[PDB]
Amino acid sequence: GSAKDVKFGADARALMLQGVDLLADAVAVTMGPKGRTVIIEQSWGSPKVTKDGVTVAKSIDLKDKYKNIGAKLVQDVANNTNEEAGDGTTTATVLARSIAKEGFEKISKGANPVEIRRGVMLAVDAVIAELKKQSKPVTTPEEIAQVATISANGDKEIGNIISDAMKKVGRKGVITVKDGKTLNDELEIIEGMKFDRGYISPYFINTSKGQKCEFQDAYVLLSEKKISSIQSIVPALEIANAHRKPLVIIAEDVDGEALSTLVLNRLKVGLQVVAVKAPGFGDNRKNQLKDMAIATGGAVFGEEGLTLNLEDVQPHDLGKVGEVIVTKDDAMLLKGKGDKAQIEKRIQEIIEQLDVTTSEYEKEKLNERLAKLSDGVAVLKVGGTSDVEVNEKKDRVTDALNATRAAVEEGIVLGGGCALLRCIPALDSLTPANEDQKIGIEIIKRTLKIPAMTIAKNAGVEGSLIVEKIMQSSSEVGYDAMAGDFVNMVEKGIIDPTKVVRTALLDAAGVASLLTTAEVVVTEIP
Amino acid sequence: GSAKDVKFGADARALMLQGVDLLADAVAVTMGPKGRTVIIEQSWGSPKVTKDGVTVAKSIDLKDKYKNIGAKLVQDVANNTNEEAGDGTTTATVLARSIAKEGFEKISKGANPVEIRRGVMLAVDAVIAELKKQSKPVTTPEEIAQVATISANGDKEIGNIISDAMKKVGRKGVITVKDGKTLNDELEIIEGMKFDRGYISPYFINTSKGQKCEFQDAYVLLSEKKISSIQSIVPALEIANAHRKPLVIIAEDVDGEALSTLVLNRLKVGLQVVAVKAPGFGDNRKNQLKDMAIATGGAVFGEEGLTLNLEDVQPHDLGKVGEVIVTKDDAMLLKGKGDKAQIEKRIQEIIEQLDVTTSEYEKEKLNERLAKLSDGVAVLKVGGTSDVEVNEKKDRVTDALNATRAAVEEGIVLGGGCALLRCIPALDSLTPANEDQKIGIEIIKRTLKIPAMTIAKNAGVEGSLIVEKIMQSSSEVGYDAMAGDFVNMVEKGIIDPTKVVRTALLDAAGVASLLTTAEVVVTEIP
Amino acid sequence: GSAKDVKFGADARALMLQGVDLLADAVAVTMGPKGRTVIIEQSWGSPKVTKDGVTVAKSIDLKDKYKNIGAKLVQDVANNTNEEAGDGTTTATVLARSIAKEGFEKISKGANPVEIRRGVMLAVDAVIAELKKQSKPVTTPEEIAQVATISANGDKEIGNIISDAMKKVGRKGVITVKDGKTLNDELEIIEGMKFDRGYISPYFINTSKGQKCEFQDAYVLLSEKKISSIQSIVPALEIANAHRKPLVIIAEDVDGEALSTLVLNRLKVGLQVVAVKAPGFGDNRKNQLKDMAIATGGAVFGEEGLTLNLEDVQPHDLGKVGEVIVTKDDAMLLKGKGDKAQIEKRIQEIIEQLDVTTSEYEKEKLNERLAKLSDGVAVLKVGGTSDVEVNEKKDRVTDALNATRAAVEEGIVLGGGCALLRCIPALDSLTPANEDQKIGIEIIKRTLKIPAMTIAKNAGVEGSLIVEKIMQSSSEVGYDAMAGDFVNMVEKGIIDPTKVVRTALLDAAGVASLLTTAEVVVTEIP
Numbered sequence A, B, C: 001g002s003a004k005d006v007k008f009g010a011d012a013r014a015l016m017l018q019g020v021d022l023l024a025d026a027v028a029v030t031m032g033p034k035g036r037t038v039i040i041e042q043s044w045g046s047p048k049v050t051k052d053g054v055t056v057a058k059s060i061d062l063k064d065k066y067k068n069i070g071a072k073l074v075q076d077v078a079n080n081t082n083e084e085a086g087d088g089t090t091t092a093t094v095l096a097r098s099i100a101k102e103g104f105e106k107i108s109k110g111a112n113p114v115e116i117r118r119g120v121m122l123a124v125d126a127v128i129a130e131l132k133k134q135s136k137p138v139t140t141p142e143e144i145a146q147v148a149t150i151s152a153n154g155d156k157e158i159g160n161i162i163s164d165a166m167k168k169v170g171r172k173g174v175i176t177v178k179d180g181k182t183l184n185d186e187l188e189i190i191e192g193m194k195f196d197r198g199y200i201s202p203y204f205i206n207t208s209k210g211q212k213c214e215f216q217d218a219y220v221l222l223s224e225k226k227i228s229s230i231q232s233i234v235p236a237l238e239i240a241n242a243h244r245k246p247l248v249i250i251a252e253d254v255d256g257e258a259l260s261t262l263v264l265n266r267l268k269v270g271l272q273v274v275a276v277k278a279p280g281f282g283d284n285r286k287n288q289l290k291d292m293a294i295a296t297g298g299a300v301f302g303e304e305g306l307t308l309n310l311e312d313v314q315p316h317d318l319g320k321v322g323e324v325i326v327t328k329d330d331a332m333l334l335k336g337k338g339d340k341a342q343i344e345k346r347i348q349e350i351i352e353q354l355d356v357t358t359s360e361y362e363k364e365k366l367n368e369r370l371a372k373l374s375d376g377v378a379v380l381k382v383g384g385t386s387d388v389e390v391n392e393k394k395d396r397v398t399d400a401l402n403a404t405r406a407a408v409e410e411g412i413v414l415g416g417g418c419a420l421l422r423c424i425p426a427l428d429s430l431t432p433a434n435e436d437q438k439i440g441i442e443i444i445k446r447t448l449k450i451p452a453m454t455i456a457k458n459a460g461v462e463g464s465l466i467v468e469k470i471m472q473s474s475s476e477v478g479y480d481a482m483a484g485d486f487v488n489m490v491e492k493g494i495i496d497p498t499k500v501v502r503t504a505l506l507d508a509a510g511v512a513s514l515l516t517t518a519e520v521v522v523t524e525i526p
């Protein structure tokens, strides 16, 4: 209904590129360990002085509609990189601006956007392949500490606490980060579990910050079979309502009818309940549900042998947990105080079954169940002096933990933009179909130098000469910005996960192609 | 009572054509499988990046009143093409603009708009005749999948689910699409019925999105005869009100008084009851109501042998259904739970009557009742992560259903704009009355290369040479845009319903004539 | 969401420097004993005539965003100097402007900001080393009076009261400053204690002026162990809310659970409670809690001998104090009227144990234990003629207290600006790495005479010749400005703590580097 202003072709692409140029100029100065300083004017108090690319990026909002939406496009892409891999906002932004500007200048000469995009994406796939083949896995906790410290903007405390948590629980363990009311960060191992199923309907989310649902002292309903009837879930809801506690139900599949009833009941004020799918696809589902029932304390409803009907639900027949955190893909049941003697008996039964037989596939499940029932949940409470400080530190710790998980899962590569510099040689092997694909290959190859050049420039040195030396030098040493010398990157501690570099290059190429190939831009009149 | 600005003749037609030019220029870049990108500025969040022409068209609102109303004219015509055949908004828009601009240029030279319109519609009707001539009837489910997948803008999931639904239920079966709470689309066959009658009065509509009326757990009053007395419908409404369920009545004809009473009680807060014309007119009217009474459950009021008066209405004699969704022309009664033993007995009676005699006109009715009581209603539940996403997905799959129906109702025809490229030869057999009808026929034959040229242009190639090759080549191969090569069109699966092309050409010609012949344009003073 | 203006490099640093120049010019005139006069327009009464630089600084807000944020940066840095040392807002401001202007003029010639900052930091470190090298401690109450009078801008009465309070209590004793209704400042010694542990959660703060929590007639709960259960803190809270009196609890560590419960109880209107950590690291903690229990009157809950479970708390079993002041690192319990006979018995026991054996590390602790109970809190009640001039005078007395504590903590140096003048020979021994670090050394050595020059200029004389005479003169005399002659600076009275000079130089150098090395400045559009 609102009157629009419509711009076509390069007329709109130029303005969008101006917006992305302002964004990338603002966020480029903050890149590296020697990142420059940005002062953001606060409308209520003292100005905010930061060297963080995420804050600088989320800070700017342009007045021009076209510039603002180009900046918003690149900015949301960088946010996606940050939220997916824990790092890469500034790198994705500088790569995106490089690719977009080079593509715009090549297209304005009269080239084909589609062929250039094809060449750019073939180059990107080659680079990602080489960067994956050059990755190395983490083998020692010191590498975990290095990765966490780099991902936390050089914060040694965050790296140390994350490495300690991964030492206590495991590299593939369960670590969570909540707020703390004290003045120093504290590491706590508490009893809890986490399994690879998320909420069926995204309508129970209590918290909009991280697409989570947080509950305190929530009842656990277990039903290994489908809900028999409405008169079988209604008594459980009545019991939960009368017992002043929320409900967390886990079953096979609650999609069509009971899910609709729960969603419509969610609209009621004061009614809280979530649904999660059962963890496994066979005997693992049954034994994991038995483990959860033992750890929570209660009874299992719907068993083939016991034939316990959901209609005859009792307060003592449901599980109990302290804190519930359910996400889109994973669900966390925290502080489940069940029968300790029963938990010990179940542990004894599991360890007795461990030394019975091995099949190379079910023994992995048995070891996993032992780990879930034995290894606690690492909680990293974040302390500070005010709400803003605890929030910012919580975000930094969460992002560092995400980047550490990414390093564990895939591996690590040389930091400081050196990983993308060792990916240049493989662009010689590939051959383009036409001249525009070769133009895209050139665009990408003059782009992998941008992160290292930016980091060196922020260090104060003339980054062109440094990257020339880096390319001339061997494949194990690179340029350090803290010390200002070419050092062996791998053991100096300057390493980042393969995932962040992959995601940054992919996101940058995607948004740059979108910026250089968008034909019509529709904006509301100012 | 508000001051108007009035413009006359070409002075207003020029401005309206400027508006339609901006609309068609913005929506023309998103045409084909290779369609360019429109960045639509959202006022509250990130910009909306889309390649879908219906969204681009919905986005555009001009500031100039005359340009805006020209854009709105072509926009609503394209919307009617969409809502009538589920596909053809961008083609209708580009042909609209082509014909309108060509006729405007031929009329500014001093031609007669009436003679040009006559020639244009002569040409259009010839093209529609040849396009009916070249249609082919779908004969295999893979063609249904191809049609659904094209009509869904290349979504393979929509094509696959629609083909599975039309394999489970049938090509001319009952398929409905409803929202869903889960994260994936699930196909479900649910017991229901649908007949070819719609609500009598368009005042009971609960849903404004689609001229529909949705109910849950509704009563079904049946009276094969007419309502004898008002004291014969007041007790039924009293029972409905006291039994907390919305009545749904089906009589012969309710127009004069009972319908007026129902409409005046509709304005009461919380009163819900709809009337539906009796389904049949002969013996089918006599037996389909028995079928519905057996399905829902209860008794039939007004029989010629049972004399069951409507005054003695009882809660055990009315029908029951789960969902009632009635449209202007058709009505669906979903989840009618009745005596399954009675339904089995009715099916046994029908299959016994099947092998009794054959009349070549009543066997069809027998098999139709067999299918209505046997083939369940396919419901395609649509799930996602946000109300806007589930609404977009619902609209896309609904349009794909409409286009598949349009394909299985009249046939298919070569896609990619080649359908309108093999209708050009027909324009040489006709002969105009005067020179201006020849002018209009030239306009139309020039307009018939515009869809193929637009698709090729969006693919990155020079569409004129491609359409020259298509007209020089044989009558079975056309130009692909995903693979960028001349390929036999029918085998790969580039086919669209002949109805969408027919409707697009008719709609485009109508709005173009209305734009090049309107003489006075009255607009509110800004 | 707010649109921003983003400025880069010198095109922003220049405007920020203009802001800091306006701020420093306005606050520089008020520097010294002979400080000039500033009239500040009061928008409700008569203008405010002041010679005090903190009011002038806090009085200045520029209309331009970039200038205002440069001014605000230097303002907050000067405020930090004033709030962590009690004196040095104007000296820090003038040094900061000097360093920033000189760095800006050297960088605009083409220098490297990183290297200039490195030279500046090495120069500042050398200067601070020599400042620590030339500091002398306080040896008589006369010097306490001198430093208090200088830190109160010449007020002989503030110096006198602070010196008398330090004579009565001690140079390392508890002195506090509250408001009062009389017309003349009065000194009172009252019973109370203070220990080096502050609050655990910064959410109980009733006072927002000085991050304090102020209570009147508050109950004291003691527990030298972890809270047994919620079923033992609930009765405590019930007792506290039944006897119409707040609670002050001291424990071992209340961070995770009970702290969260006290914070959520802090969110209800009518509930007040604070928590403090245990005072000691061993036997000192136990005996200090014993002393506090005797001084407050009641019982100790949680001993290994008495085993007084926290589930049997009674009103006679809790301690009582008059006024409670809790800060971030310190806690004060004031007017705790316990059993005077029990306090005398405790004092007799302590003085009897003070003659058994000494160990050179626990006799000190015994002295401290006796002093906590024996030395009374010195409260300096401030009063006058209205509400605003009691806040003003209380701020002045508090800042003078802070500077006297800084003097009795590290030492004193030659006032007037000669302290920074005697540190000039330091900068002749250090050697720079390159020419830009020599530029930084020159900047700092030229900056080291700005305060003396400013004080002399405000006196009425050409300060360049005065500082030349001071540098040519012996290392014990310097220019007086209340007399106008070069006098022996040490026995005349003109001395300031080394901590104010050190903090001012650090703060000036830090904000000046920030100002001359900030690359991007983001402000909202006006």
Ligand SMILES: Nc1ncnc2c1ncn2[C@@H]1O[C@H](COP(=O)(O)OP(=O)(O)O)[C@@H](O)[C@H]1O
Pocket: A030, A031, A032, A033, A035, A053, A054, A087, A088, A089, A090, A091, A092, A150, A414, A415, A416, A417, A451, A455, A479, A480, A481, A482, A494, A495, A496
């Ligand atoms: N000591 C160091 N020397 C060189 N490069 C470093 C050093 N520490 C971190 N880096 C590099 O800094 C880059 C990330 O920093 P920054 O740009 O602030 O964050 P982001 O990952 O959001 O872009 C990484 O590429 C990393 O390799």
Ligand SMILES: Nc1ncnc2c1ncn2[C@@H]1O[C@H](COP(=O)(O)OP(=O)(O)O)[C@@H](O)[C@H]1O
Pocket: B030, B031, B032, B033, B035, B053, B054, B087, B088, B089, B090, B091, B092, B150, B153, B414, B415, B416, B417, B451, B455, B479, B480, B481, B482, B494, B495, B496
């Ligand atoms: N692979 C393909 N090659 C060539 N044309 C295609 C292909 N897929 C779809 N098309 C054509 O695209 C046209 C429809 O696309 P589009 O313009 O987005 O929708 P609309 O039907 O609303 O105009 C149809 O004419 C169809 O024939």
Ligand SMILES: Nc1ncnc2c1ncn2[C@@H]1O[C@H](COP(=O)(O)OP(=O)(O)O)[C@@H](O)[C@H]1O
Pocket: C030, C031, C032, C033, C035, C053, C087, C088, C089, C090, C091, C092, C150, C153, C414, C415, C416, C417, C451, C455, C479, C480, C481, C482, C494, C495, C496
């Ligand atoms: N009689 C005096 N002669 C010379 N200098 C003095 C005298 N009294 C105070 N000063 C100097 O004045 C300076 C502090 O005054 P002022 O600038 O008003 O406060 P601030 O410490 O906030 O800058 C100190 O450096 C001190 O040495």
Ligand SMILES: [Mg+2]
Pocket: A087, A088, A150, A151, A152, A153
């Ligand atoms: Mg980072």
Ligand SMILES: [Mg+2]
Pocket: B087, B088, B150, B151, B152, B153
């Ligand atoms: Mg389509």
Ligand SMILES: [Mg+2]
Pocket: C087, C088, C150, C151, C152, C153
């Ligand atoms: Mg002072």
